[PDB]
PDB file of all heavy atoms in Angstrom:
ATOM      1  N   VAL A   1     -10.325   3.071  -5.804  1.00 58.18           N
ATOM      2  CA  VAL A   1      -9.636   2.107  -6.648  1.00 58.18           C
ATOM      3  C   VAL A   1      -9.499   2.653  -8.059  1.00 58.18           C
ATOM      4  O   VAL A   1      -8.419   2.619  -8.644  1.00 58.18           O
ATOM      5  CB  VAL A   1     -10.385   0.765  -6.706  1.00 58.18           C
ATOM      6  CG1 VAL A   1      -9.684  -0.187  -7.666  1.00 58.18           C
ATOM      7  CG2 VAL A   1     -10.493   0.153  -5.317  1.00 58.18           C
ATOM      8  N   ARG A   2     -10.601   3.169  -8.596  1.00 59.24           N
ATOM      9  CA  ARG A   2     -10.612   3.695  -9.952  1.00 59.24           C
ATOM     10  C   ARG A   2      -9.599   4.827 -10.078  1.00 59.24           C
ATOM     11  O   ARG A   2      -8.815   4.864 -11.027  1.00 59.24           O
ATOM     12  CB  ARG A   2     -12.015   4.186 -10.325  1.00 59.24           C
ATOM     13  CG  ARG A   2     -12.319   4.152 -11.819  1.00 59.24           C
ATOM     14  CD  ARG A   2     -11.441   5.118 -12.597  1.00 59.24           C
ATOM     15  NE  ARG A   2     -11.308   4.724 -13.994  1.00 59.24           N
ATOM     16  CZ  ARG A   2     -10.529   3.732 -14.412  1.00 59.24           C
ATOM     17  NH1 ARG A   2      -9.820   3.033 -13.539  1.00 59.24           N
ATOM     18  NH2 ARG A   2     -10.461   3.434 -15.701  1.00 59.24           N
ATOM     19  N   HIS A   3      -9.610   5.741  -9.114  1.00 59.07           N
ATOM     20  CA  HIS A   3      -8.712   6.889  -9.155  1.00 59.07           C
ATOM     21  C   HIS A   3      -7.271   6.517  -8.798  1.00 59.07           C
ATOM     22  O   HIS A   3      -6.400   7.387  -8.712  1.00 59.07           O
ATOM     23  CB  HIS A   3      -9.228   8.014  -8.257  1.00 59.07           C
ATOM     24  CG  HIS A   3     -10.558   8.557  -8.678  1.00 59.07           C
ATOM     25  ND1 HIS A   3     -10.703   9.451  -9.716  1.00 59.07           N
ATOM     26  CD2 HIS A   3     -11.805   8.331  -8.199  1.00 59.07           C
ATOM     27  CE1 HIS A   3     -11.983   9.752  -9.861  1.00 59.07           C
ATOM     28  NE2 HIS A   3     -12.672   9.085  -8.953  1.00 59.07           N
ATOM     29  N   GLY A   4      -7.027   5.225  -8.595  1.00 59.59           N
ATOM     30  CA  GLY A   4      -5.684   4.729  -8.354  1.00 59.59           C
ATOM     31  C   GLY A   4      -5.131   5.032  -6.974  1.00 59.59           C
ATOM     32  O   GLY A   4      -3.938   4.848  -6.722  1.00 59.59           O
ATOM     33  N   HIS A   5      -5.994   5.501  -6.081  1.00 58.01           N
ATOM     34  CA  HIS A   5      -5.594   5.773  -4.706  1.00 58.01           C
ATOM     35  C   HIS A   5      -5.042   4.518  -4.044  1.00 58.01           C
ATOM     36  O   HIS A   5      -4.220   4.593  -3.133  1.00 58.01           O
ATOM     37  CB  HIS A   5      -6.773   6.313  -3.898  1.00 58.01           C
ATOM     38  CG  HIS A   5      -7.232   7.668  -4.338  1.00 58.01           C
ATOM     39  ND1 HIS A   5      -6.378   8.745  -4.430  1.00 58.01           N
ATOM     40  CD2 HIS A   5      -8.455   8.121  -4.701  1.00 58.01           C
ATOM     41  CE1 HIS A   5      -7.055   9.806  -4.838  1.00 58.01           C
ATOM     42  NE2 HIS A   5      -8.316   9.455  -5.008  1.00 58.01           N
ATOM     43  N   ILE A   6      -5.499   3.363  -4.511  1.00 59.63           N
ATOM     44  CA  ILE A   6      -5.082   2.090  -3.944  1.00 59.63           C
ATOM     45  C   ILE A   6      -3.924   1.498  -4.738  1.00 59.63           C
ATOM     46  O   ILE A   6      -3.514   2.049  -5.759  1.00 59.63           O
ATOM     47  CB  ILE A   6      -6.246   1.094  -3.924  1.00 59.63           C
ATOM     48  CG1 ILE A   6      -7.577   1.835  -3.762  1.00 59.63           C
ATOM     49  CG2 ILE A   6      -6.045   0.060  -2.826  1.00 59.63           C
ATOM     50  CD1 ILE A   6      -7.708   2.607  -2.466  1.00 59.63           C
ATOM     51  N   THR A   7      -3.401   0.371  -4.265  1.00 58.92           N
ATOM     52  CA  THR A   7      -2.282  -0.295  -4.923  1.00 58.92           C
ATOM     53  C   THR A   7      -2.139  -1.739  -4.460  1.00 58.92           C
ATOM     54  O   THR A   7      -2.644  -2.114  -3.405  1.00 58.92           O
ATOM     55  CB  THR A   7      -0.952   0.434  -4.661  1.00 58.92           C
ATOM     56  OG1 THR A   7       0.125  -0.320  -5.231  1.00 58.92           O
ATOM     57  CG2 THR A   7      -0.713   0.583  -3.169  1.00 58.92           C
ATOM     58  N   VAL A   8      -1.441  -2.543  -5.254  1.00 58.88           N
ATOM     59  CA  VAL A   8      -1.220  -3.945  -4.929  1.00 58.88           C
ATOM     60  C   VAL A   8       0.215  -4.321  -5.243  1.00 58.88           C
ATOM     61  O   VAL A   8       0.622  -4.296  -6.402  1.00 58.88           O
ATOM     62  CB  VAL A   8      -2.143  -4.863  -5.746  1.00 58.88           C
ATOM     63  CG1 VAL A   8      -1.813  -6.321  -5.476  1.00 58.88           C
ATOM     64  CG2 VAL A   8      -3.599  -4.568  -5.426  1.00 58.88           C
ATOM     65  N   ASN A   9       0.980  -4.668  -4.210  1.00 59.80           N
ATOM     66  CA  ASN A   9       2.389  -5.035  -4.372  1.00 59.80           C
ATOM     67  C   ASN A   9       3.249  -3.907  -4.947  1.00 59.80           C
ATOM     68  O   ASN A   9       4.464  -4.060  -5.093  1.00 59.80           O
ATOM     69  CB  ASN A   9       2.535  -6.292  -5.235  1.00 59.80           C
ATOM     70  CG  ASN A   9       1.803  -7.485  -4.657  1.00 59.80           C
ATOM     71  OD1 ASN A   9       0.667  -7.368  -4.199  1.00 59.80           O
ATOM     72  ND2 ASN A   9       2.451  -8.644  -4.682  1.00 59.80           N
ATOM     73  N   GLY A  10       2.615  -2.784  -5.279  1.00 59.32           N
ATOM     74  CA  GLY A  10       3.324  -1.637  -5.821  1.00 59.32           C
ATOM     75  C   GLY A  10       2.610  -0.961  -6.976  1.00 59.32           C
ATOM     76  O   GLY A  10       2.639   0.261  -7.100  1.00 59.32           O
ATOM     77  N   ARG A  11       1.971  -1.755  -7.827  1.00 61.80           N
ATOM     78  CA  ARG A  11       1.272  -1.221  -8.992  1.00 61.80           C
ATOM     79  C   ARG A  11      -0.049  -0.555  -8.624  1.00 61.80           C
ATOM     80  O   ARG A  11      -0.812  -1.069  -7.807  1.00 61.80           O
ATOM     81  CB  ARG A  11       1.043  -2.318 -10.035  1.00 61.80           C
ATOM     82  CG  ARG A  11       2.286  -2.683 -10.840  1.00 61.80           C
ATOM     83  CD  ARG A  11       3.353  -3.375  -9.988  1.00 61.80           C
ATOM     84  NE  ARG A  11       3.003  -4.758  -9.665  1.00 61.80           N
ATOM     85  CZ  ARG A  11       3.807  -5.610  -9.031  1.00 61.80           C
ATOM     86  NH1 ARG A  11       5.017  -5.226  -8.646  1.00 61.80           N
ATOM     87  NH2 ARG A  11       3.402  -6.848  -8.783  1.00 61.80           N
ATOM     88  N   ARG A  12      -0.312   0.594  -9.237  1.00 60.22           N
ATOM     89  CA  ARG A  12      -1.524   1.356  -8.970  1.00 60.22           C
ATOM     90  C   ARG A  12      -2.721   0.813  -9.740  1.00 60.22           C
ATOM     91  O   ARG A  12      -3.263   1.486 -10.616  1.00 60.22           O
ATOM     92  CB  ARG A  12      -1.317   2.833  -9.311  1.00 60.22           C
ATOM     93  CG  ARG A  12      -0.762   3.087 -10.709  1.00 60.22           C
ATOM     94  CD  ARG A  12      -0.641   4.579 -10.993  1.00 60.22           C
ATOM     95  NE  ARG A  12       0.059   5.282  -9.921  1.00 60.22           N
ATOM     96  CZ  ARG A  12       0.281   6.594  -9.903  1.00 60.22           C
ATOM     97  NH1 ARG A  12      -0.143   7.354 -10.905  1.00 60.22           N
ATOM     98  NH2 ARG A  12       0.926   7.145  -8.883  1.00 60.22           N
ATOM     99  N   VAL A  13      -3.131  -0.403  -9.405  1.00 61.54           N
ATOM    100  CA  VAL A  13      -4.284  -1.022 -10.046  1.00 61.54           C
ATOM    101  C   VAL A  13      -5.549  -0.180  -9.874  1.00 61.54           C
ATOM    102  O   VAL A  13      -5.991   0.077  -8.753  1.00 61.54           O
ATOM    103  CB  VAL A  13      -4.533  -2.442  -9.493  1.00 61.54           C
ATOM    104  CG1 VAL A  13      -5.762  -3.065 -10.147  1.00 61.54           C
ATOM    105  CG2 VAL A  13      -3.293  -3.321  -9.694  1.00 61.54           C
ATOM    106  N   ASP A  14      -6.125   0.250 -10.990  1.00 63.78           N
ATOM    107  CA  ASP A  14      -7.348   1.043 -10.949  1.00 63.78           C
ATOM    108  C   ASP A  14      -8.557   0.267 -11.478  1.00 63.78           C
ATOM    109  O   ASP A  14      -9.635   0.831 -11.664  1.00 63.78           O
ATOM    110  CB  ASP A  14      -7.171   2.365 -11.705  1.00 63.78           C
ATOM    111  CG  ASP A  14      -6.976   2.167 -13.192  1.00 63.78           C
ATOM    112  OD1 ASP A  14      -6.703   1.025 -13.612  1.00 63.78           O
ATOM    113  OD2 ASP A  14      -7.103   3.157 -13.944  1.00 63.78           O
ATOM    114  N   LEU A  15      -8.367  -1.025 -11.721  1.00 61.07           N
ATOM    115  CA  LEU A  15      -9.448  -1.882 -12.193  1.00 61.07           C
ATOM    116  C   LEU A  15     -10.255  -2.411 -11.025  1.00 61.07           C
ATOM    117  O   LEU A  15      -9.803  -3.306 -10.312  1.00 61.07           O
ATOM    118  CB  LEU A  15      -8.895  -3.071 -12.979  1.00 61.07           C
ATOM    119  CG  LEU A  15      -7.952  -2.820 -14.162  1.00 61.07           C
ATOM    120  CD1 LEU A  15      -8.280  -1.488 -14.841  1.00 61.07           C
ATOM    121  CD2 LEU A  15      -6.484  -2.882 -13.736  1.00 61.07           C
ATOM    122  N   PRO A  16     -11.466  -1.873 -10.834  1.00 63.17           N
ATOM    123  CA  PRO A  16     -12.352  -2.342  -9.764  1.00 63.17           C
ATOM    124  C   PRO A  16     -12.522  -3.846  -9.865  1.00 63.17           C
ATOM    125  O   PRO A  16     -12.815  -4.502  -8.866  1.00 63.17           O
ATOM    126  CB  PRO A  16     -13.679  -1.652 -10.075  1.00 63.17           C
ATOM    127  CG  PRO A  16     -13.290  -0.425 -10.834  1.00 63.17           C
ATOM    128  CD  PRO A  16     -12.076  -0.802 -11.637  1.00 63.17           C
ATOM    129  N   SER A  17     -12.334  -4.378 -11.071  1.00 60.41           N
ATOM    130  CA  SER A  17     -12.383  -5.816 -11.301  1.00 60.41           C
ATOM    131  C   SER A  17     -11.240  -6.494 -10.561  1.00 60.41           C
ATOM    132  O   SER A  17     -11.295  -6.663  -9.350  1.00 60.41           O
ATOM    133  CB  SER A  17     -12.290  -6.122 -12.796  1.00 60.41           C
ATOM    134  OG  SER A  17     -13.286  -5.425 -13.524  1.00 60.41           O
ATOM    135  N   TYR A  18     -10.205  -6.871 -11.304  1.00 59.53           N
ATOM    136  CA  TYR A  18      -9.017  -7.506 -10.743  1.00 59.53           C
ATOM    137  C   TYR A  18      -9.333  -8.517  -9.645  1.00 59.53           C
ATOM    138  O   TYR A  18      -9.648  -8.145  -8.514  1.00 59.53           O
ATOM    139  CB  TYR A  18      -8.023  -6.462 -10.215  1.00 59.53           C
ATOM    140  CG  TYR A  18      -6.675  -7.062  -9.874  1.00 59.53           C
ATOM    141  CD1 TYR A  18      -5.531  -6.698 -10.570  1.00 59.53           C
ATOM    142  CD2 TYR A  18      -6.550  -8.009  -8.864  1.00 59.53           C
ATOM    143  CE1 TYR A  18      -4.301  -7.257 -10.266  1.00 59.53           C
ATOM    144  CE2 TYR A  18      -5.329  -8.574  -8.554  1.00 59.53           C
ATOM    145  CZ  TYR A  18      -4.205  -8.195  -9.256  1.00 59.53           C
ATOM    146  OH  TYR A  18      -2.986  -8.759  -8.943  1.00 59.53           O
ATOM    147  N   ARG A  19      -9.227  -9.801  -9.971  1.00 63.03           N
ATOM    148  CA  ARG A  19      -9.384 -10.835  -8.955  1.00 63.03           C
ATOM    149  C   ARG A  19      -8.144 -10.914  -8.076  1.00 63.03           C
ATOM    150  O   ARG A  19      -7.073 -11.331  -8.518  1.00 63.03           O
ATOM    151  CB  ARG A  19      -9.705 -12.197  -9.579  1.00 63.03           C
ATOM    152  CG  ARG A  19     -11.115 -12.290 -10.154  1.00 63.03           C
ATOM    153  CD  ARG A  19     -11.793 -13.592  -9.761  1.00 63.03           C
ATOM    154  NE  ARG A  19     -11.031 -14.754 -10.208  1.00 63.03           N
ATOM    155  CZ  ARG A  19     -11.184 -15.330 -11.396  1.00 63.03           C
ATOM    156  NH1 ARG A  19     -12.076 -14.852 -12.257  1.00 63.03           N
ATOM    157  NH2 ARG A  19     -10.445 -16.384 -11.724  1.00 63.03           N
ATOM    158  N   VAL A  20      -8.304 -10.500  -6.824  1.00 63.27           N
ATOM    159  CA  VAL A  20      -7.207 -10.482  -5.871  1.00 63.27           C
ATOM    160  C   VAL A  20      -6.791 -11.893  -5.462  1.00 63.27           C
ATOM    161  O   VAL A  20      -7.522 -12.592  -4.761  1.00 63.27           O
ATOM    162  CB  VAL A  20      -7.597  -9.692  -4.613  1.00 63.27           C
ATOM    163  CG1 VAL A  20      -6.404  -9.561  -3.679  1.00 63.27           C
ATOM    164  CG2 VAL A  20      -8.143  -8.324  -5.003  1.00 63.27           C
ATOM    165  N   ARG A  21      -5.612 -12.310  -5.903  1.00 64.95           N
ATOM    166  CA  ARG A  21      -5.100 -13.621  -5.537  1.00 64.95           C
ATOM    167  C   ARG A  21      -4.791 -13.649  -4.047  1.00 64.95           C
ATOM    168  O   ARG A  21      -4.677 -12.599  -3.417  1.00 64.95           O
ATOM    169  CB  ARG A  21      -3.839 -13.936  -6.334  1.00 64.95           C
ATOM    170  CG  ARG A  21      -3.919 -13.567  -7.800  1.00 64.95           C
ATOM    171  CD  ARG A  21      -2.665 -14.016  -8.518  1.00 64.95           C
ATOM    172  NE  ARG A  21      -1.478 -13.787  -7.699  1.00 64.95           N
ATOM    173  CZ  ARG A  21      -0.246 -14.147  -8.047  1.00 64.95           C
ATOM    174  NH1 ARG A  21      -0.034 -14.759  -9.205  1.00 64.95           N
ATOM    175  NH2 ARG A  21       0.773 -13.900  -7.235  1.00 64.95           N
ATOM    176  N   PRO A  22      -4.673 -14.857  -3.471  1.00 65.70           N
ATOM    177  CA  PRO A  22      -4.280 -14.998  -2.066  1.00 65.70           C
ATOM    178  C   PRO A  22      -2.838 -14.550  -1.827  1.00 65.70           C
ATOM    179  O   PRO A  22      -1.955 -14.854  -2.629  1.00 65.70           O
ATOM    180  CB  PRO A  22      -4.411 -16.505  -1.815  1.00 65.70           C
ATOM    181  CG  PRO A  22      -5.347 -16.990  -2.861  1.00 65.70           C
ATOM    182  CD  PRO A  22      -5.062 -16.146  -4.063  1.00 65.70           C
ATOM    183  N   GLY A  23      -2.613 -13.836  -0.726  1.00 64.98           N
ATOM    184  CA  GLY A  23      -1.292 -13.354  -0.366  1.00 64.98           C
ATOM    185  C   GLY A  23      -0.845 -12.150  -1.171  1.00 64.98           C
ATOM    186  O   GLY A  23       0.107 -12.232  -1.940  1.00 64.98           O
ATOM    187  N   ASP A  24      -1.523 -11.024  -0.983  1.00 66.23           N
ATOM    188  CA  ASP A  24      -1.211  -9.823  -1.747  1.00 66.23           C
ATOM    189  C   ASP A  24      -1.280  -8.577  -0.876  1.00 66.23           C
ATOM    190  O   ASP A  24      -2.172  -8.444  -0.044  1.00 66.23           O
ATOM    191  CB  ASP A  24      -2.176  -9.685  -2.929  1.00 66.23           C
ATOM    192  CG  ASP A  24      -1.967 -10.759  -3.989  1.00 66.23           C
ATOM    193  OD1 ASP A  24      -0.847 -11.306  -4.075  1.00 66.23           O
ATOM    194  OD2 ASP A  24      -2.921 -11.047  -4.747  1.00 66.23           O
ATOM    195  N   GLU A  25      -0.332  -7.666  -1.069  1.00 65.38           N
ATOM    196  CA  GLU A  25      -0.336  -6.402  -0.341  1.00 65.38           C
ATOM    197  C   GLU A  25      -1.308  -5.416  -0.969  1.00 65.38           C
ATOM    198  O   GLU A  25      -1.005  -4.783  -1.980  1.00 65.38           O
ATOM    199  CB  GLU A  25       1.067  -5.787  -0.287  1.00 65.38           C
ATOM    200  CG  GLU A  25       2.052  -6.533   0.603  1.00 65.38           C
ATOM    201  CD  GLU A  25       3.388  -5.817   0.726  1.00 65.38           C
ATOM    202  OE1 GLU A  25       3.498  -4.668   0.246  1.00 65.38           O
ATOM    203  OE2 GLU A  25       4.330  -6.401   1.303  1.00 65.38           O
ATOM    204  N   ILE A  26      -2.481  -5.291  -0.362  1.00 64.91           N
ATOM    205  CA  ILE A  26      -3.464  -4.312  -0.807  1.00 64.91           C
ATOM    206  C   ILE A  26      -3.208  -2.948  -0.153  1.00 64.91           C
ATOM    207  O   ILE A  26      -4.110  -2.334   0.424  1.00 64.91           O
ATOM    208  CB  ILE A  26      -4.902  -4.798  -0.525  1.00 64.91           C
ATOM    209  CG1 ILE A  26      -5.041  -6.264  -0.943  1.00 64.91           C
ATOM    210  CG2 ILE A  26      -5.926  -3.925  -1.251  1.00 64.91           C
ATOM    211  CD1 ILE A  26      -6.451  -6.803  -0.874  1.00 64.91           C
ATOM    212  N   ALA A  27      -1.967  -2.481  -0.254  1.00 64.35           N
ATOM    213  CA  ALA A  27      -1.545  -1.230   0.371  1.00 64.35           C
ATOM    214  C   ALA A  27      -2.232  -0.005  -0.228  1.00 64.35           C
ATOM    215  O   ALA A  27      -3.119  -0.128  -1.073  1.00 64.35           O
ATOM    216  CB  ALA A  27      -0.032  -1.085   0.280  1.00 64.35           C
ATOM    217  N   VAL A  28      -1.819   1.175   0.226  1.00 61.79           N
ATOM    218  CA  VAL A  28      -2.293   2.434  -0.342  1.00 61.79           C
ATOM    219  C   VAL A  28      -1.143   3.189  -1.017  1.00 61.79           C
ATOM    220  O   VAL A  28      -0.020   3.215  -0.506  1.00 61.79           O
ATOM    221  CB  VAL A  28      -2.960   3.328   0.730  1.00 61.79           C
ATOM    222  CG1 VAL A  28      -3.201   4.735   0.189  1.00 61.79           C
ATOM    223  CG2 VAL A  28      -4.261   2.707   1.209  1.00 61.79           C
ATOM    224  N   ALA A  29      -1.427   3.796  -2.169  1.00 57.89           N
ATOM    225  CA  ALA A  29      -0.412   4.529  -2.921  1.00 57.89           C
ATOM    226  C   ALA A  29       0.187   5.663  -2.090  1.00 57.89           C
ATOM    227  O   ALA A  29      -0.482   6.240  -1.233  1.00 57.89           O
ATOM    228  CB  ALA A  29      -0.998   5.063  -4.220  1.00 57.89           C
ATOM    229  N   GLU A  30       1.451   5.982  -2.353  1.00 59.63           N
ATOM    230  CA  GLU A  30       2.173   6.986  -1.575  1.00 59.63           C
ATOM    231  C   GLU A  30       1.454   8.328  -1.544  1.00 59.63           C
ATOM    232  O   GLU A  30       1.137   8.843  -0.473  1.00 59.63           O
ATOM    233  CB  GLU A  30       3.593   7.167  -2.116  1.00 59.63           C
ATOM    234  CG  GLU A  30       4.679   6.491  -1.289  1.00 59.63           C
ATOM    235  CD  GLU A  30       4.594   4.971  -1.308  1.00 59.63           C
ATOM    236  OE1 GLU A  30       3.472   4.428  -1.387  1.00 59.63           O
ATOM    237  OE2 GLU A  30       5.659   4.317  -1.237  1.00 59.63           O
ATOM    238  N   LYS A  31       1.192   8.891  -2.718  1.00 61.18           N
ATOM    239  CA  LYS A  31       0.538  10.192  -2.806  1.00 61.18           C
ATOM    240  C   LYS A  31      -0.807  10.203  -2.085  1.00 61.18           C
ATOM    241  O   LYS A  31      -1.234  11.235  -1.567  1.00 61.18           O
ATOM    242  CB  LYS A  31       0.334  10.600  -4.266  1.00 61.18           C
ATOM    243  CG  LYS A  31      -0.441  11.904  -4.431  1.00 61.18           C
ATOM    244  CD  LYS A  31      -1.161  11.971  -5.775  1.00 61.18           C
ATOM    245  CE  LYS A  31      -2.093  13.179  -5.845  1.00 61.18           C
ATOM    246  NZ  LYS A  31      -2.968  13.169  -7.050  1.00 61.18           N
ATOM    247  N   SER A  32      -1.470   9.051  -2.054  1.00 62.88           N
ATOM    248  CA  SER A  32      -2.815   8.957  -1.498  1.00 62.88           C
ATOM    249  C   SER A  32      -2.825   8.714   0.011  1.00 62.88           C
ATOM    250  O   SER A  32      -3.886   8.697   0.634  1.00 62.88           O
ATOM    251  CB  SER A  32      -3.614   7.865  -2.217  1.00 62.88           C
ATOM    252  OG  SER A  32      -3.682   8.118  -3.614  1.00 62.88           O
ATOM    253  N   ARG A  33      -1.645   8.537   0.593  1.00 61.89           N
ATOM    254  CA  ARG A  33      -1.541   8.224   2.014  1.00 61.89           C
ATOM    255  C   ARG A  33      -2.121   9.314   2.912  1.00 61.89           C
ATOM    256  O   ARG A  33      -2.870   9.023   3.845  1.00 61.89           O
ATOM    257  CB  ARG A  33      -0.089   7.933   2.396  1.00 61.89           C
ATOM    258  CG  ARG A  33       0.432   6.617   1.838  1.00 61.89           C
ATOM    259  CD  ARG A  33       1.839   6.309   2.328  1.00 61.89           C
ATOM    260  NE  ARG A  33       2.263   4.970   1.930  1.00 61.89           N
ATOM    261  CZ  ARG A  33       2.148   3.889   2.695  1.00 61.89           C
ATOM    262  NH1 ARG A  33       1.626   3.986   3.910  1.00 61.89           N
ATOM    263  NH2 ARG A  33       2.560   2.712   2.247  1.00 61.89           N
ATOM    264  N   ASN A  34      -1.777  10.565   2.635  1.00 63.14           N
ATOM    265  CA  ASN A  34      -2.264  11.680   3.441  1.00 63.14           C
ATOM    266  C   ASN A  34      -3.495  12.362   2.851  1.00 63.14           C
ATOM    267  O   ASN A  34      -3.498  13.572   2.629  1.00 63.14           O
ATOM    268  CB  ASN A  34      -1.151  12.702   3.687  1.00 63.14           C
ATOM    269  CG  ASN A  34      -0.511  13.192   2.403  1.00 63.14           C
ATOM    270  OD1 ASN A  34      -0.654  12.577   1.345  1.00 63.14           O
ATOM    271  ND2 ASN A  34       0.208  14.306   2.491  1.00 63.14           N
ATOM    272  N   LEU A  35      -4.538  11.580   2.595  1.00 63.91           N
ATOM    273  CA  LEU A  35      -5.783  12.124   2.063  1.00 63.91           C
ATOM    274  C   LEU A  35      -6.840  12.314   3.144  1.00 63.91           C
ATOM    275  O   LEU A  35      -6.978  11.491   4.048  1.00 63.91           O
ATOM    276  CB  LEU A  35      -6.331  11.243   0.941  1.00 63.91           C
ATOM    277  CG  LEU A  35      -6.036  11.736  -0.476  1.00 63.91           C
ATOM    278  CD1 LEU A  35      -6.598  10.766  -1.505  1.00 63.91           C
ATOM    279  CD2 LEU A  35      -6.603  13.138  -0.681  1.00 63.91           C
TER     280      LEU A  35
END
């Protein structure tokens, strides 16, 4: 998360905090897909 490997709705959220609202795409960033 910190390294931005993750993403939400598109934005590379790197805040381990961030309260995830209901109904959100906790996808994986493009570059990070083939890790």
Side-chain angles (χ1 to χ4, degrees):
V1 176
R2 207 295 156 284
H3 298 281
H5 293 306
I6 329 298
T7 175
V8 175
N9 301 43
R11 284 68 74 174
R12 52 178 50 181
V13 179
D14 66 345
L15 306 329
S17 306
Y18 191 116
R19 288 225 302 271
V20 185
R21 317 184 320 176
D24 292 336
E25 290 185 8
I26 315 187
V28 169
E30 257 67 327
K31 176 206 172 189
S32 302
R33 290 184 173 265
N34 55 343
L35 260 179

